[PDB]
Amino acid sequence: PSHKTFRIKQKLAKAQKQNRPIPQWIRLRTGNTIRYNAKRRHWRKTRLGL
Amino acid sequence: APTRVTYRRRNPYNTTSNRTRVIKTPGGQLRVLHIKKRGTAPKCGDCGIKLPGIPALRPREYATISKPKKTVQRAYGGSRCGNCVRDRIIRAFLIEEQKIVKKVLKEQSQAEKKASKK
Amino acid sequence: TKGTSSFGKRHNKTHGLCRRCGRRSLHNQKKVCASCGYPAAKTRKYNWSEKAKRRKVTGTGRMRYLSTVPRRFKNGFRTGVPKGARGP
RNA sequence: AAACUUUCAACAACGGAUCUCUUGGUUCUGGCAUCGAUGAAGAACGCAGCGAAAUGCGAUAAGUAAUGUGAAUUGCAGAAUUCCGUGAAUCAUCGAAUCUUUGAACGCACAUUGCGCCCGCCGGUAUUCCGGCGGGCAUGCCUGUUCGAGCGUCAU
RNA sequence: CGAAAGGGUCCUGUAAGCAGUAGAGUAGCCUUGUUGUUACGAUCUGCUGAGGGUAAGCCCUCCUUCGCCUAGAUUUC
RNA sequence: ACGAGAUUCCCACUGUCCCUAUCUACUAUCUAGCGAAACCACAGCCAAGGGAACGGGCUUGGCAAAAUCAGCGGGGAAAGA
RNA sequence: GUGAGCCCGGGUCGAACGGCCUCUAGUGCAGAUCUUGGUGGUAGUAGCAAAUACUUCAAUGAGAACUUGAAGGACCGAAGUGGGGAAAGGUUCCAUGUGAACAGCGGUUGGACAUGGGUUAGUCGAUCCUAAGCCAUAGGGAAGUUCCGUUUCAAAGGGGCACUCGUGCCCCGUGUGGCGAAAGGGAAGCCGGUUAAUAUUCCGGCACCUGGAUGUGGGUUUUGCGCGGCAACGCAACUGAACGCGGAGACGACGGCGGGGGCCCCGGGCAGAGUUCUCUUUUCUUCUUAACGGUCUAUCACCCUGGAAACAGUUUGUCUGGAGAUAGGGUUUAAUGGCCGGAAGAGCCCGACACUUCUGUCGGGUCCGGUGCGCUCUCGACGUCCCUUGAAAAUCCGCGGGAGGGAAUAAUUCUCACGCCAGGUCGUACUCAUAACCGCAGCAGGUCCCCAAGGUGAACAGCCUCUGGUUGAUAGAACAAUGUAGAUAAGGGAAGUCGGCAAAAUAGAUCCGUAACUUCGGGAAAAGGAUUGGCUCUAAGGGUUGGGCACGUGCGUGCGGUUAACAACCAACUUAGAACUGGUACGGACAGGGGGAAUCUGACUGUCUAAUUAAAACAUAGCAUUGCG
RNA sequence: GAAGCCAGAGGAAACUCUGGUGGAGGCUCGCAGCGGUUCUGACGUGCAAAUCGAUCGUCAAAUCUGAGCAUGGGGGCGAAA
RNA sequence: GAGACCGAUAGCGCACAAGUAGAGUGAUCGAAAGAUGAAAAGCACUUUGAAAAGAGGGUUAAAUAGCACGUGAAAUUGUUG
Ligand SMILES: [Zn+2]
Ligand SMILES: [Zn+2]
């Protein structure tokens, strides 16, 4: 809701900052095995569980 | 013209603390205005009638107005009405007079008993 | 109407976030954590759940102080500086 | 006759078996005794020039000091190193430190970044007001100190 | 051959508009009633078996108009 | 008195039949795009016989000609049977 | 080679492997409705059919039914497909860009993907208070994790005075703390403007609350702590500790009646727009005024005079009065009322110029009335119901008391006016649903609230419309069978079928009329009948204001009169009656009882087997028994 | 259209009749809401692991409903299935 | 430090950002998933396409190794005979 506690808003802020694709330079590193963000979240797919 | 309105606060329920009235603005718009509950007239401590001459406000609004607006220039003014004050005065005077009379009668009876014993 | 129609009335929360263990297991009306047992002083664990014990046992986290203890033991819990070292 | 269905073959598909590999498991043996109110285990939130995670770290934040080694790091960018040196490095070691909010968790609370109390220091006109900063204030029990209570036992 | 149009044949039921000494009554102006008059007023009458529709699986039309045409592609003892 | 309680009858009423017909929409149908599942030993024309009251395959006959579309509900399949 | 198998050739491939004798085992598969993974036929098949519906041109683009602009046609129809919120979600919000994947088609579009941006408060919430309730403390249980306990079998602490036997004395009693509501209680903010996206938060103007310090003016006082009024009480002030009293906070449901705001409706006027074959002095749009203050007023009630039967006053509703009515005169609670400040300078409407942009500039106006069984909110006075009587606390004020403190070296410890200073922390985007929540989903389900226009009509019924939203749910063609949904049918009228299942018939309103039975309340809209359109008239039902003389001088007396039974002005919706007129229909769509005779059964209203049974089951009031001082 | 109330006509009074007024009820028709009676209903690998249409019950209260809180499996709660 | 153990459906659930992703109100439940090449030398340049890509032409010892990547079986499919 619009009404939210500071703790809940801090968790939402961390989730918003985590929500991104990986930088493209990650794939060019020596011996890289990361191809995409396997922990990517979307607001319609998986709940944060708060 | 748009005639329908909305609440201006986040309470959506028609509770006793969510009273609104409709105004028209200088901008020509129909709007709500959130208002407080009506003030309550102070009442007599003896009979419970509404006290004449005293404003009816919410309780903390009485701290902002001066003393002569909150009281009546009489004993028990702003706390008891005039009829109850008159009853108090008459009852007090008559009961103390009756106490004096009873004390006189008791002294006379005691003197008669002492004279009979002696 | 005990299925799909009744599932539409689910908009409350039995559990919130626990301050001690971080899970969504703090019963909002009992103020008692189902996972870690907060606010009791002991952390809740049972021998009938080896998996639950191993999910939270020592070493599953950061070991911020405990990981430095074996090195200090190996060097004998010594104090001081090397001889002739730069400093104050 | 073709098409269709089926059979056989070659090549091409589909799929991931087989073979070979293994910075991983599994079992056995040998050695060692070292968590925490001097705040642990665990949790949350942060920290890189360019990172979401894993890793490392804590506002001194992919780290500081110190010791050792002795020329890198590297995906890009940018800089190196007086190379005859208080010195690179995502190096090793590690005795000095830093170590946010919490948690046995400790002013009272916490579904709140809520409300206090004591003592200093600094700033804003400032004896009164406002603000910032620092150090403190849990419980049970022990030893001692000091202040007490009770015809409980006495002396005078 | 096609699209229109005209004529026929069917279906409905008398168009819009104008007019009327038709219209229960009401209100004005004056000759104060002698269609007194003017205004309104469902409706009625006339122009008007009128208007509208008519092949989409109705009919006719070298001689009422306008347009189209000897292709293209595929295959075959 | 009240009743989405159970029952019999009467008047009205009518496409419940008699006895069926016609109209409209959405499907079904055809096309473009998109696109499953149930089920599946192998397969699917019958008749008589096949001791154990059962034949789809065996015996003896009838027969029997590519590849297909809309329907259909006799078997065969099909009931979280 | 009988066989399980063994060996070789050819092709592919890229790093290890085999024979013999012994040793060793997790050592040999077709089945286990196995286990895991992968793949077929079915099959380009079943469908992709609820929520009325789409079309034209242009642009963009490789490509357009489902992108955009314009042009049309429709729907939601104010209990919305509208405008905002609570829960829940958490960036879905805004801008720019976009291959694939997703949006059961398509996609240039997107809640998808990529990069950035966006949430501003002393006044709105939280924060404070307590509610139902929950947890510490004392203390007692329990092997113990822990259980009870929340005022207790607790030394559970506040204030004042003191120069002396200086290292004390006095007063008081109430207990014990914390958590617990973004719908309860509660200090205070409005209007205009502004962004791509926030705004009672930003900007501008204009205010308020709380707390603190200390001035000026005014007030009080030499009769020390104001004056006036018969009174109700008034006025800018006008001392007031301990300890007490009282009020507010603070309160049910329902009924009609009256006041006020807003909405709806009607008339005129200026300005603009549309219609214009004909008609229409026409139809439509703007015409507004906040918080905060000042002033004048507004039901109840209270005060003064006086003394009422020939009882009077008086509501829609029969209450009030010698416990003092009526009447007359006053005092007051109560504004969302009138006027004024705010404030026309704003907002809105119209016009004339300027204008590459940057940018605008200047004129004119924004007015006056009416109505009501209307709708909605609010206030007031009444009334009804209860074997039901409908929170608490924080907090604020008044009073009783008279402790202290107080003046002419002037004093002031004045709830008056003005002035000075200060006000921390989060939360604030967006959705709130036929795509932002839950249901495995962008699921025809479910999920708490306000605000709610015009017509018809009894009516937030159904149907049509305005503002504001949509036009989103795979599309094109054809019109076989069988379906689903909606209809009609001559004559007969239940012959059908287990059974009138289904359908049809009835239905609004006015009037006539209405049986048995009955717990006398009902039955009852029983039954059975007569009517309803349009037009032109008639009648009835209201409001406001207004009386002649004689003196003093627009008010005071002394009279005189109840034909004002009259005039003037204003206003609305019902009801009844009559003529004329169309007709196959007149509650012309919509909306809307079929009725009757009986039987069984449970008294009734109510409740349950969420997802096969709604009932003679359960409950119920009434009745009866038992136990307990 | 219950009590209460007004008027008129009677009655010695109590009361009786007539016309109004008033607005009672776990009364009634019925919109929303709540519920869930019926239909050879739709749907039956559905829009849906209970949905859709028409119809129906109730609709001023033993009515409907949110949040906070309480009762926990040898249990609870139960107008009782 | 080792093994007459297992060799990615085996061996711990986990050889990989595994007690992760994901699910459940919760207690808890809990995967899948390794291999281009010696070296990225991971295809310059030309050309066709809106693009994805295709064709030439290089790189490599090999593209019959093209970030769908060692080998590449069967079920099942396409073309050709
Ligand atoms: Zn009184
Ligand atoms: Zn926990």
From TrEMBL, chain A:
One of its GO terms (molecular function) is structural constituent of ribosome. Gene3D superfamilies: Ribosomal protein L39e. GO terms for biological process: translation. InterPro entries: Ribosomal_eL39 (IPR000077), Ribosomal_eL39_dom_sf (IPR023626). Pfam families: Ribosomal_L39. Belongs to the eukaryotic ribosomal protein eL39 family. This is Large ribosomal subunit protein eL39. It comes from Chaetomium globosum (strain ATCC 6205 / CBS 148.51 / DSM 1962 / NBRC 6347 / NRRL 1970) (Soil fungus).
Automatic annotation (TrEMBL), chain B:
It comes from the Eukaryota. InterPro entries: Ribosomal_eL34, Ribosomal_eL34_C_sf, Ribosomal_eL34_CS. GO terms for molecular function: structural constituent of ribosome. GO terms for biological process: translation. It holds the Pfam family Ribosomal_L34e. GO terms for cellular component: ribonucleoprotein complex; ribosome. Transmembrane segments: none annotated. Keywords: Metal-binding, Ribonucleoprotein, Ribosomal protein, Zinc. Gene3D superfamilies: 6.20.340.10, 6.20.370.70. Zn(2+) binds at C44, D46, C47, C81, C84. PANTHER family: 60S RIBOSOMAL PROTEIN L34 (PTHR10759). Belongs to the eukaryotic ribosomal protein eL34 family. This is Ribosomal protein l34-like protein.
From TrEMBL, chain C:
One of its GO terms (cellular component) is cytosolic large ribosomal subunit. One of its GO terms (molecular function) is structural constituent of ribosome. It comes from the Eukaryota. InterPro entries: Ribosomal_eL37 (IPR001569), Ribosomal_eL37/eL43 (IPR011331), Ribosomal_eL37_CS (IPR018267), Ribosomal_zn-bd (IPR011332). Residues 74-88 are annotated as: Disordered. The keyword Lipid biosynthesis does not apply. NCBIfam families: PRK04179.1 (NF003214). Component of the large ribosomal subunit. The ribosome is a large ribonucleoprotein complex responsible for the synthesis of proteins in the cell. Belongs to the eukaryotic ribosomal protein eL37 family. This is Ribosomal protein L37.
